[PDB]
């Protein structure tokens, strides 16, 4: 039978998908990843599908690969499913045509997510699923967590009986990550609904050599059209089949559905047609408004394809005079969005009454669709009746938006308690909120709903939880805007965010802070808050969560205290039961290590309940003195755009605020100064050997070396301690290691590697450091950076260069950013970056924080994110542009040399042409040209003067993670490197798909634990470097900052200067690897990665062969035997040891064996005497010739495929045999 | 001036595409192959485009690779074109959203060909071009060998001035391979129709470390929707621009 | 043994034996082959070919290398050799043939081989 | 034993006739004789080197193990299971049903650094 | 739409929209859907709109 459960849309549908499928081909993409991961976990735990078998799941190299495997699996007679979204669904489109064209019962579960256009978005809308509406797949929408479960089941059953593949979809995040208490069917009940005759027919018609057939033929005009129409019967019947299964499932669950469902006044005059989670919020509003006499209604679209106009009309009240169709997408240039056009077709074909039909757009990229907005929509139908409108934004550019009145009354059912929790990443708030949802749902008749807003910031980010509990079903698919309970778990928020926004009168406000004394509170708590607390007679509670946690021994960990606060003050449960339930569950969870860690939590609760007293505030708060604006100076863009966004007001920025093409300017992160490190380094100048390694190693550019001349230190603060500069070249300069304490993330890598025993860097609390260092860094930032003093590519020298990628949203201690920071210090001013989607694009450019910046001269990396799969080709394109445009420039130069241009100009041109591709010479002469041709606007010299941004040789780089490089973009990477063109590929190998949640990649090593390799990966790590080296003309190298910063810089210079393709693979530490002693040990782990032989460093340089020397050089020494401790020092390996000690020992021994073999192979490579060495290049010369020119026999066929304008000449088509055979037959036949 | 010649839809189109482009990323697929092969042979023969430059053409590993290259070339300031159809066009779809989304003057010449479903067909119909109707590309059809030449030119001129990528298409075989005596314009005539200011502007806004910007950001619910609607003013001007160039 | 089950279970329609009797087209171990040209294997389908080979599963890939995209009209591919004339290689290809074989051999667990009927039918 | 085996012999020197016997090569000789001559010589050298490399592969005593499969056994484990510091971030991308539990997010420095700060700030 | 109507004769009583494609399960093919929407938004006269499919895979259209 049934079973109650609180879960999200994802697990609700994965629950059914696992039961109904035998095979699944998958690939990770947010927000669908959860489904595949749960399927893998369940299969590993032993869960059986309806056939008593565990699922056969496999991760492909991309969604295109999964789609092909799904097709093959179905073709070969196995029920198959997949989970995907957005960009991924797009890659599956070609196979969708094949899967439906071949009438295969496949089922795709899609979490509708936005497609990347002017920008990428992981959030929800229907752009992706609408992009596939013509593939022939049936499309069934579910609008709630409970509907996801039901529709997933209907889709599968219907796909099996109808033979038409189905795409079951639900809104990304809004439905996929929303938690609800729902009911799910047993697998046995699902099995009982399966049409057995159909299943057997599927099996019998499938591919099998015992009774073969041919599929995928190529057809000519004589029969293609007929063959395409032969499936009609099937599409005509699918609708009735879907209704039939909606009915059968209803007899088991009690929840009925129709292809189109209607809710609202039966005599409604104004109706809305919508699809997805929006239907839930719309219905809630209808209940509220209809109860006031409003004649409104809603038609919920279930089956979107095939579109059965008859079922649409069955749901349409004849009284409707105005109908608004809501589309959750945007098709630029179309006369209207999909659903709108479908509805219009229904009315014209019916050819009768024509009510006013309006089209409306909403919810792009999970944009809120709230009750107020629904009111706007309904008001519009009785008022202006604006058409093709937008709602949810202010379109002050084209004026397509409906105005929205946010005073609209709360419409949640009577008796709904709404909660909001403001937490700090990793403080356990979300996990506590989820527990409270399970606890409450399992122990009451209350409906529970939870949704979570996260931060683009991976570290120290803010989280906002929205929970609702009630006696009536919760249809609020929108954030809480009028909360009964608001908890602010981080005191730093009090003064920076509008935390009490919309909280109800007499509402409860809990704050975690050490401001126990009325004087303390008055001191820290701002006025706006005080006035709000006072004027709304809010039950304000304060609690030093940090002091209690410490006191009971929980070491300042606040989750349990704030959890107790919720259970005690939220008012969803009675004091007794709540405290009881909370405790019972504490023994439930925990209980693992003795009752000692159980007592501390039990105690923490007891103490919390006691300390949880209603803070009393003076009635004078009613009008506290509004404070001033002690805000520093910044950009107009940071003031008008990013600041508003960073403080949760982006929703108020109108369209006029953004660039039509989605671009953002560089360096907006320079002003964020979040200051979230708990501990920051403290420079101890007495111990400093002035090496600059600390700045080189910082993942966030938080360390600023200073090299000043006496005169520059004049107004220097008293505490701006500077050492006399060590070094022959620095004789006379003052040196300083200035810590940027607000941008520091407090990872500790710098301090960890600082050379001297008596450390020159020591971690101290942020407070003990800011007052002194904030003004100091601000003074230093104004001291010219001495880039001309030392070699740009020397360890010390590089840090005397301007880093052009700073303060990114990467995790504290991230292993990727140090590498990227250094590269900019070496080529930043003349580079192009084609960045593959991934962590690097995420910390690289999450609006509105832009970490890449320009130097003092305005130059900086031209950075761009195309897609996840095409970074290499994207960069290759940029390289094609430069080739074309710089060749055009060269041609103008050469022409100008043969004109009456002045001797100076001519000398400069000649110099540029000669040094065209040299960074030093091209800039030297190009710079003379900007001067000489300044002002020239006419003729040849004019064109040349207008092409100055093309004078100095550019550096095209392609940045990407291992998932990009070894998997999805490998084919493109391989082709680009094989092109022999001058591009630079930098691969940050984290040995997993990091950004998406640690999924295994072909770069994942043997024995490593990761998603889809949860028992340890059972295939060795793909050898991308050795594969690329077979080309012979591509520069290939490996690096590891921790092992050698010099070898890294050497590699950087040699790769970039190579006049061909370059590939550099770097070892990148990541939080997913689980470094046991913290990410601050990254540099040391990189060091060990190399020494252990786990990550050998080498270089393959084709130009050495061009001079009789071996292109391959080993840069590290043989395995030193430390691999075992290197692996055990990472949880990705250690967990397997604790869980499967037997197989883990074996897998770690295999790694040591593989690396030992590999090192030995690299050794003969370096010892070899055989290698590719001929001519550098040469050739060309205008002219083309066709491979068929002058052939003795036909060189092309009779096919339409080879027909060309010039083809058609008579030729010997090889039907008379060899030239000799014909000759001999000629002789023999003489006559 | 004008010039009488007897050729097919493919060549009539490629004749214009070569003249109006600086860069091309290609991949072979019937019935559009002729165009790319032609553009390649002409480049190797030294034919000059309207800028007196021979075309920079490279063959990718697939159409997806080709489309990514086209996106990159456009992003970096070069006028770019590509030739495709059917299955190839489908693989270009992800990039089409990015190309129209960043408002780039790209021009795709497509020989409309059927999509492989119950079977593969190299023949003509609009299944492929309809599959890309929501990518944001303007779509201009030519129904005859003579129109292929004219629309190809309108498409290029209109893309440059409007900043909206264009998909110029004609029927696979029925037009791409039909031979007709028609009139083509000299490259000089085409060059004189080009909006020199729009062109300079396209180059000034392109990617360049000398005056950088960030493109392809990742955006949250707070601003994505507004950002997607910001291009409306460009799509509103497209119709007028096409009509102007037709005239 | 599968052929013996076909005779022993002929007629079985009920229970376990019936279910087994209905699965005879699965008794004999099958041979899964993947056919394709060099354009597929060295270019467009390379990433999937690579991924599938790395999977370690039991499949057989047979590549008919014509050193060009033949069907479409002789366009060059990464399998096209140095100096060979083909569309997009109008003055003879200026990059050498991609070594697909040596690239795949780097896994160590994939069986790789090259053949040429004209030289040895036995090999 | 060595997995790699060479089935043909060292170049016999007839490569030039081989190429010239095919129009894809000969046509270049007739149109760009100088470049053709260069490229055919480049091919001859490329194969010379390749064969020599295949001969080393065949004569090497350096190679790795092999086993079809086995081991894993029922059960799986999350890579974050019992880690000392957070293994996931504050991103909606890494969010999962079971995530949300407090952990050391690496903003307080290393274990050792944290430990030494405790020792020093004791009080 | 404005340009579409500038081309439609006011005398037109029946209009057939020909689509050279097939979208299985769609209430209509693309061009047809676009034209229907044109008439619906105009709000005036509603001639009979007919949808027809032709020319798939180069099928003759004589
Ligand atoms: C944002 C987006 O949708 C990301 S982030 C990226 C992670 C890749 O990891 P890689 O190892 O290359 O780099 P890392 O994160 O540094 O480890 C993936 C799988 N995708 C999801 C995804 C899936 N499939 C496709 C076609 N496109 C996208 N964008
Ligand atoms: C008929 C069809 O559309 C063929 S025939 C094939 C030639 C492949 O050559 P390969 O060397 O792999 O094999 P060969 O012919 O035996 O030499 C191509 C390029 N395609 C065209 C093509 C292009 N791009 C995409 C995505 N799909 C297809 N089907
Ligand atoms: S602790 Fe980490 S973020 Fe802070 S200055 Fe040191 S390396 Fe940079
Ligand atoms: S790592 Fe230490 S010794 Fe080196 S420059 Fe930095 S503070 Fe000084
Ligand atoms: S690579 Fe790892 S450590 Fe760096 S930002 Fe990504 S998840 Fe964080
Ligand atoms: Ca290079
Ligand atoms: Mg990675
Ligand atoms: Mg071939």
> Degrees (nearest 5) of the Cα angle A432, A435, A436?
90
Residues of A in contact with C85 (CB under 8 A): 1185-1187
Contact A662 B115 (CB under 8 A): no
Q: Which CATH architecture has domain A785-1169?
A: 3-Layer(aba) Sandwich (3.40)
Q: For domain A1-257, give the CATH number.
A: 3.40.50.970
- What does R_g of chain D's alpha carbons equal in angstroms? 31
- What does R_g of chain B's alpha carbons equal in angstroms? 17
Alpha-carbon distance of A1045 to A1039, in angstroms, equals 9
Sign of the Cα pseudo-torsion (A988, A992, A996, A998, in order): negative
- What does R_g of chain E's alpha carbons equal in angstroms? 13
How many alpha carbons fall within 13 Å on the CB side of residue A1057?
11
How many alpha carbons fall within 13 Å on the CB side of residue A1227?
5
Quote the DSSP letter at residue A556. Answer: T
Per residue in A817-852, is it b (16+ CB within 10 Å) or e — as a string? bbbbbbbbbbbbbbbbbbbbbbbbbbbbbbbbbbbb
The yes-or-no reply on E/D contact (3 CB pairs or more, < 8 Å) is: no
Alpha-carbon distance of A430 to D101, in angstroms, equals 7
Residues of C in contact with A1183 (CB under 8 A): 90-91
Alpha-carbon distance of A405 to A374, in angstroms, equals 10
Contact C47 A68 (CB under 8 A): no
Cis omega (within 30 of 0) on the bond before A848?
yes
User: Which CA distances in Å does B239 have to A1217, B103, B154, B245?
Assistant: 60, 15, 12, 10
Contact C72 B29 (CB under 8 A): yes
Q: For domain A1170-1231, give the CATH number.
A: 4.10.790.10
- Tokens 């006049």 sit at which residue? A1059
Could you tell me which of A849, A1219, A851, A917 has the C-alpha nearest to residue A1059? Answer: A917
- Both structure tokens of A36: 């595949």
H or E element, residue A58: strand A56-59
Sign of the Cα pseudo-torsion (A866, A872, A877, A879, in order): positive
Q: Is A63 a catalytic residue?
A: yes
- Tokens 């056994």 sit at which residue? D73
Cβ(A1033)–Cβ(A1013) under 8 Å? no
Alpha-carbon distance of A175 to A124, in angstroms, equals 9
- Both structure tokens of A148: 């996801």
Could you tell me which of A1016, A1015, A1036 has the C-alpha nearest to residue A1026? Answer: A1036
Could you tell me which of D99, D82, C50, D69 has the C-alpha nearest to residue A37? Answer: D99
Per residue in A670-683, is it b (16+ CB within 10 Å) or e — as a string? bbbebbbbbbbbbb
Could you tell me which of A982, A980, A923, A993 has the C-alpha nearest to residue A958? Answer: A982
What's the N-to-C CA distance of chain E in angstroms? 29
- Both structure tokens of A284: 């809630």
Alpha-carbon distance of A387 to A400, in angstroms, equals 8
Q: Which one of A37, A38, A59, A63 is the catalytic residue?
A: A63
Residues of D in contact with A557 (CB under 8 A): 102
Cis omega (within 30 of 0) on the bond before A121?
no
Could you tell me which of A316, A287, A1084, A392 has the C-alpha nearest to residue A750? Answer: A1084
Identify the bridge partners of residue A4 per DSSP, sorted by sequence position.
A183
CATH class name, domain A668-784: alpha beta
How many alpha carbons fall within 13 Å on the CB side of residue D122?
3
Q: Using CB atoms within 10 A of its CB, is residue A554 exposed (0-12), middle (13-18) or buried (19+)?
A: buried
Q: Which one of A175, A416, A692, A995 is the catalytic residue?
A: A995
Cβ(C94)–Cβ(D49) under 8 Å? no
What is the fold of A627-667?
Answer: Pyruvate-ferredoxin Oxidoreductase; domain 4 (4.10.780)
- Both structure tokens of A834: 């084609």
Whether residue A361 has its Cβ less than 6 Å from ligand 3: no
Q: Is A38 a catalytic residue?
A: no
Cβ(A647)–Cβ(A830) under 8 Å? no
Experimental technique of record: X-ray
- Both structure tokens of A512: 């975690």
Give the ligand at the shortest distance from the Cα of A749.
Answer: 3
Chain centre distance of CA A189:
38
* Preferred mutation among C87, C92, C93, C94 to probe B, highest tally of B CBs within 10 A: C87
Contact D107 A676 (CB under 8 A): yes
Could you tell me which of A845, A865, A861 has the C-alpha nearest to residue A853? Answer: A861
H or E element, residue A289: helix A278-290
Helix (H/G/I), strand (E/B), else coil: A890: helix
Sorted by sequence, the CB contacts under 8 Å of residue A334 that are 6+ apart come out as A341, B133, B134, E34
Dihedral angle of Cα C20, C21, C25, C27, to the nearest 10 degrees = 60
Q: Is A113 a catalytic residue?
A: yes
Q: Which one of A7, A10, A30, A81 is the catalytic residue?
A: A30
Alpha-carbon distance of B209 to A745, in angstroms, equals 29
Cβ(A1211)–Cβ(A1191) under 8 Å? yes
H or E element, residue A418: strand A417-424
> Degrees (nearest 5) of the Cα angle E49, E55, E60?
125
How many alpha carbons fall within 13 Å on the CB side of residue D51?
13
> Degrees (nearest 5) of the Cα angle A642, A648, A653?
60
Could you tell me which of A1083, A1087, A1071 has the C-alpha nearest to residue A1130? Answer: A1071
User: Helix count (H) and strand count (E) of chain B?
Assistant: 10, 11
Chain E residues within 8 A (CB-CB) of chain A?
1, 21-28, 32-34, 36-41, 43, 46, 48-49, 55-60
> Degrees (nearest 5) of the Cα angle A918, A922, A924?
120
- Tokens 């009964």 sit at which residue? A484
What's the N-to-C CA distance of chain B in angstroms? 17
Dihedral angle of Cα A373, A376, A381, A383, to the nearest 10 degrees = -170
Whether residue A681 has its Cβ less than 6 Å from ligand 3: yes
| DSSP helix, strand, coil percent of chain D (3-state; round to 5) | 45, 0, 55
Sorted by sequence, the CB contacts under 8 Å of residue A667 that are 6+ apart come out as A850, A852, A853, A854, A860
Cβ(A417)–Cβ(A571) under 8 Å? yes
Q: Which one of A34, A111, A113, A776 is the catalytic residue?
A: A113
User: Which CA distances in Å does A493 have to A424, A487, A527?
Assistant: 9, 11, 14
In CATH terms, the superfamily for domain B1-247 is: Thiamin diphosphate (ThDP)-binding fold, Pyr/PP domains (3.40.50.970)
Contact C44 B61 (CB under 8 A): yes
Helix (H/G/I), strand (E/B), else coil: B227: helix
Cβ(A853)–Cβ(A667) under 8 Å? yes
Alpha-carbon distance of A95 to A866, in angstroms, equals 23
H or E element, residue C33: strand C33-37
- State phi, psi for A633 to the nearest 5 degrees: -80, 140
**Strands A462-470 and A447-453, bridge-based pairing:** antiparallel
Closest-approach residue (CA) in chain A for B208: A862
User: Which CA distances in Å does A675 have to A459, A671, A680, A767, D42?
Assistant: 11, 11, 10, 10, 61
Task: Say how many Å lie between the CA of residue D10 and the centre of ligand 8.
Answer: 26
Residues of D in contact with C108 (CB under 8 A): 3, 63-64, 66
H or E element, residue E53: strand E48-53
Alpha-carbon distance of A37 to A18, in angstroms, equals 11
Chain B residues within 8 A (CB-CB) of chain E?
112, 114, 121, 123-127, 130, 133, 171-174, 239, 243
H or E element, residue A547: helix A545-552
Residues of C in contact with D23 (CB under 8 A): 85
* Strand-by-strand arrangement of the A166-171 sheet: A56-59, A23-26, A80-84, A107-112, A166-171, A138-141, A303-305
The beta strand positions in A1073-1117, using DSSP E, are: 1098-1100, 1112-1114
Alpha-carbon distance of A565 to A511, in angstroms, equals 10
Contact C73 B28 (CB under 8 A): yes
Report whether C71 belongs to an annotated binding site.
yes
Alpha-carbon distance of A306 to A236, in angstroms, equals 8
H or E element, residue B3: strand B2-8
Sorted by sequence, the CB contacts under 8 Å of residue A279 that are 6+ apart come out as A143, A298, A300
Could you tell me which of B172, B119, B32 has the C-alpha nearest to residue A219? Answer: B119
H or E element, residue A1133: helix A1131-1139
Could you tell me which of C74, C89, C79, C68 has the C-alpha nearest to residue C114? Answer: C79
Contact B114 E3 (CB under 8 A): no
| DSSP helix, strand, coil percent of chain C (3-state; round to 5) | 30, 10, 55
* Strand-by-strand arrangement of the A1062-1067 sheet: A1112-1114, A1098-1100, A1035-1039, A1062-1067, A984-989, A955-961, A831-835, A862-864, B214-215
Q: Which residues have C-beta atoms less than 6 Å from ligand 1?
A: A 28-30, 63, 87-88, 91, 120, 122, 836-840, 868-869, 960-964, 988, 990, 992-996, 1001
Helix axes A596-611, A545-552, angle to 10 degrees: 150
Give the ligand at the shortest distance from the Cα of A809.
Answer: 5
Helix (H/G/I), strand (E/B), else coil: A156: helix
* Answer CATH for A258-414 from 3.40.630.10, 3.40.50.720, 3.40.50.920, 3.20.20.70: 3.40.50.920
Task: Say how many Å lie between the CA of residue D72 and the centre of ligand 7.
Answer: 24
Report whether B183 belongs to an annotated binding site.
no
> Domain ranges in chain A?
1-257, 258-414, 415-626, 627-667, 668-784, 785-1169, 1170-1231
- Both structure tokens of A733: 């300069």
Q: Please state whether A732 falls in left (phi above 0), alpha (psi between -120 and 50) or beta.
A: left
H or E element, residue B25: strand B23-26
User: Which CA distances in Å does D33 have to A58, A1182, D37?
Assistant: 53, 13, 6
Q: For domain D62-123, give the CATH number.
A: 4.10.790.10
User: Which CA distances in Å does A731 have to A332, A470, A788, B81, B147?
Assistant: 63, 74, 14, 57, 75
Identify the bridge partners of residue A739 per DSSP, sorted by sequence position.
A703
Looking from the CA of residue A759, the nearest atom of ligand 4 is 2
Could you tell me which of A56, A32, A35 has the C-alpha nearest to residue A44? Answer: A56
The yes-or-no reply on A/E contact (3 CB pairs or more, < 8 Å) is: yes
Cβ(A965)–Cβ(C82) under 8 Å? no
Sorted by sequence, the CB contacts under 8 Å of residue A367 that are 6+ apart come out as A125, A392, A393, A651, B221, B224, B225
Sorted by sequence, the CB contacts under 8 Å of residue A83 that are 6+ apart come out as A14, A17, A24, A26, A32, A33, A35, A36, A39, A108, A109, A110, A111
In CATH terms, the superfamily for domain A415-626 is: Pyruvate-ferredoxin oxidoreductase, PFOR, domain III (3.40.920.10)
Alpha-carbon distance of B41 to B35, in angstroms, equals 10
- Both structure tokens of D109: 């420095």
Whether residue A747 has its Cβ less than 6 Å from ligand 5: no
Contact E46 A238 (CB under 8 A): no
Alpha-carbon distance of B206 to A122, in angstroms, equals 26
Residue length, chain E? 62
Cβ(A594)–Cβ(A571) under 8 Å? no
């Amino acid at each position: 039978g049934k079973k109650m459960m609180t879960t999200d849309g994802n697990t609700a549908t994965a629950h059914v998908a696992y039961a109904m499928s035998e095979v699944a081909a998958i690939y990770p993409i947010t927000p669908s990843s959860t489904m595949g991961e749960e399927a893998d976990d369940w299969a590993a735990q032993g869960r059986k599908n309806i056939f008593g078998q565990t699922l056969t799941i496999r991760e492909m190299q991309s969604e295109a690969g999964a789609a092909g495997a799904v097709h093959g699996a179905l073709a070969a007679g196995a029920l198959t499913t997949t989970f995907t979204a957005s960009q991924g669904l797009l890659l599956m489109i070609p196979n969708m045509y094949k899967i439906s064209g071949e009438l295969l019962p496949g089922v795709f579960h899609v979490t509708a997510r936005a497609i990347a256009a002017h920008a990428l978005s992981i959030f929800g809308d229907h752009q992706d699923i609408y992009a596939a509406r013509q593939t022939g797949f049936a499309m069934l929408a579910s609008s709630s967590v409970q509907e996801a479960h039901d529709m997933a089941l209907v889709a599968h059953l219907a796909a099996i009986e109808s033979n038409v593949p189905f795409m079951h979809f639900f809104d990304g995040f809004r439905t996929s990550h929303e938690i609800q208490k729902i009911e799910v069917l047993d697998y046995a009940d699902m099995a009982s609904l399966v049409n057995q005759k159909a299943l057997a027919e599927f099996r019998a018609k499938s591919m099998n050599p015992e009774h073969p057939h041919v599929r995928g033929t190529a057809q000519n005009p004589d029969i293609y059209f007929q063959g395409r129409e032969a499936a009609n019967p099937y599409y005509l019947k699918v609708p009735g089949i879907v209704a039939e299964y909606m009915q059968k499932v209803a007899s088991l669950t009690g929840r009925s559905y129709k292809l189109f469902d209607y809710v609202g006044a039966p005599d409604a005059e104004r109706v809305i047609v919508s699809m997805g989670s929006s239907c839930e919020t719309i219905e809630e509003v209808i209940n509220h408004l209809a109860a006031k006499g409003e004649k409104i209604g809603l038609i919920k679209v279930r089956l979107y394809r095939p579109f059965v106009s008859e079922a649409f009309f069955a749901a349409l009240p004849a009284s409707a005079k105005v109908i608004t169709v809501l589309d959750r997408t945007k098709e630029p240039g179309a006369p209207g969005d999909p659903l709108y056009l479908d509805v219009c077709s229904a009315f014209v074909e019916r050819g009768e009454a024509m009510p006013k039909i309006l089209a409306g757009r909403y919810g792009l990229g999970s944009k809120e669709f709230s009750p107020a907005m629904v009111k706007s929509v309904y008001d519009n139908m009785s008022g202006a009746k604006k058409n093709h409108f937008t709602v949810g934004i202010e379109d002050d550019v084209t004026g397509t938006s409906l105005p929205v009145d946010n005073a609209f009354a709360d419409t949640t059912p009577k008796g709904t308690i709404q909660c909001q929790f403001w937490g700090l990443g990793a403080d356990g708030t979300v996990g506590a909120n989820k527990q409270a949802i399970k606890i409450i749902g399992d122990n009451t008749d209350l409906f529970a709903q939870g949704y979570f807003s996260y931060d683009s910031k991976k570290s120290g980010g803010i989280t906002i939880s929205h929970l609702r509990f009630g006696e009536k079903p919760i249809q609020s698919t929108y954030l809480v805007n009028r909360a009964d309970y608001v908890a602010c778990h981080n005191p730093a928020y009090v003064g920076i965010y509008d935390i009490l926004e919309g909280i109800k009168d007499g509402g409860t406000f809990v704050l975690n802070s050490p401001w126990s004394s009325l004087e303390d509170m008055d001191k820290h708590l701002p006025s706006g808050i005080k006035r709000t607390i006072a004027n709304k007679k809010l039950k304000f509670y304060n609690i030093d969560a940090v002091k209690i946690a410490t006191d009971v021994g929980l070491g300042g960990r606040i989750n349990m205290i704030m959890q107790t606060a919720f259970f005690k003050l939220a008012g969803v449960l009675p004091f007794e039961k709540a405290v009881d339930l909370l405790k019972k569950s504490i023994h439930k969870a925990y209980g693992k290590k003795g009752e000692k860690i159980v007592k501390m939590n039990t105690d923490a609760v007891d103490q919390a309940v006691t300390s949880l007293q209603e803070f009393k505030y003076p009635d004078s708060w009613k009008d506290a003195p509004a404070e001033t604006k002690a805000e520093p100076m910044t950009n107009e863009f940071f003031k008008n755009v990013v600041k508003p966004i960073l403080t949760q007001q982006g929703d108020k920025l109108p369209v006029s605020a953004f660039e039509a093409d989605g671009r953002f300017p560089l360096g907006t992160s320079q002003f964020e100064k979040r200051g979230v490190a708990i501990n920051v380094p403290q420079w101890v100048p007495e111990n400093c050997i002035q090496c600059n390694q600390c700045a080189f190693v910082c993942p966030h550019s938080a360390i600023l070396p200073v090299l000043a001349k006496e005169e520059e230190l004049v107004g220097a603060p008293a505490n701006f301690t500077a050492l006399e500069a060590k070094g022959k070249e620095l004789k006379g300069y003052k040196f300083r290691i200035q810590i940027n304490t607000l941008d520091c993330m407090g990872c500790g890598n710098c301090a960890d590697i600082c050379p001297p025993k008596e450390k020159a860097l020591v971690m101290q609390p942020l407070d003990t450091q800011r007052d002194a260092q904030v003004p100091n860094l601000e003074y230093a930032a104004r001291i010219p950076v001495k880039s001309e003093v030392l070699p740009r590519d020397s360890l010390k020298g590089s840090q005397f260069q301007e880093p052009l990628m700073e303060f990114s949203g990467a995790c504290s201690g991230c292993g990727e950013t140090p590498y990227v920071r250094v590269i900019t210090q070496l080529f930043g001013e003349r580079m192009f970056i084609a960045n593959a989607t991934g962590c690097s694009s995420i910390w690289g450019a999450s609006a509105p924080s832009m970490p890449y910046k320009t130097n003092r001269l305005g130059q900086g990396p031209a950075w761009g994110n195309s897609l996840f799969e095409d970074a290499a080709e994207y960069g290759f394109g940029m390289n094609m542009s430069m080739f074309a445009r710089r060749t055009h420039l060269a041609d103008l130069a050469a022409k100008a040399l043969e004109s009456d241009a002045s001797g100076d100009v001519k000398e400069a041109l000649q110099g540029w042409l000669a040094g065209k591709n040299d960074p030093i010479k091209s800039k030297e002469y190009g710079d003379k040209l900007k001067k000489l041709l300044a002002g020239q606007k006419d003729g040849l010299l004019g064109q040349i003067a207008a092409m100055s941004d093309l004078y100095t040789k550019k550096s095209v780089w392609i940045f990407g993670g291992d998932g990009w490089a070894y998997d999805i973009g490998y084919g493109g990477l391989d082709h680009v490197l094989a092109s022999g063109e001058d591009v630079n590929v930098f691969v940050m190998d984290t040995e997993v798909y990091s950004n998406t949640g640690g999924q295994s990649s072909k770069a994942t090593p043997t024995g490593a634990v990761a998603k889809f390799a949860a028992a340890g990966k059972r295939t060795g790590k793909k050898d991308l470097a050795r594969m690329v080296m077979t080309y012979g003309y591509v520069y290939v190298a490996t690096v590891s900052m921790g092992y050698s910063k010099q070898q890294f810089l050497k590699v950087l210079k040699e790769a970039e200067s190579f006049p061909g393709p370059s590939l550099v693979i770097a070892y990148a530490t990541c939080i997913n690897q689980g470094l046991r002693k913290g990410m601050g040990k990254s540099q040391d782990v990189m060091n060990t990665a190399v020494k252990s032989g786990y990550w050998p460093l080498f270089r393959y340089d084709p130009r050495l062969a061009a001079q009789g020397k071996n292109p391959f050089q080993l840069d590290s020494k043989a395995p030193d035997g430390s691999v075992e401790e290197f692996l055990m020092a990472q949880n990705r390996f250690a967990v397997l040891d604790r869980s499967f000690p037997e197989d883990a020992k074996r897998l770690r021994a295999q790694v040591a064996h593989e690396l030992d073999v590999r090192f030995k192979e690299l050794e003969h490579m370096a010892a070899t005497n055989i290698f590719e060495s001929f001519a550098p290049a040469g050739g060309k010369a205008d002219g083309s010739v066709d491979f068929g020119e002058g052939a003795e026999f036909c060189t092309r066929d009779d096919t339409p495929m080879m027909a060309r304008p010039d083809s058609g000449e008579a030729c010997d088509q090889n039907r008379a045999g060899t030239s000799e055979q014909q000759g001999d037959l000629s002789k023999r036949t003489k006559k």
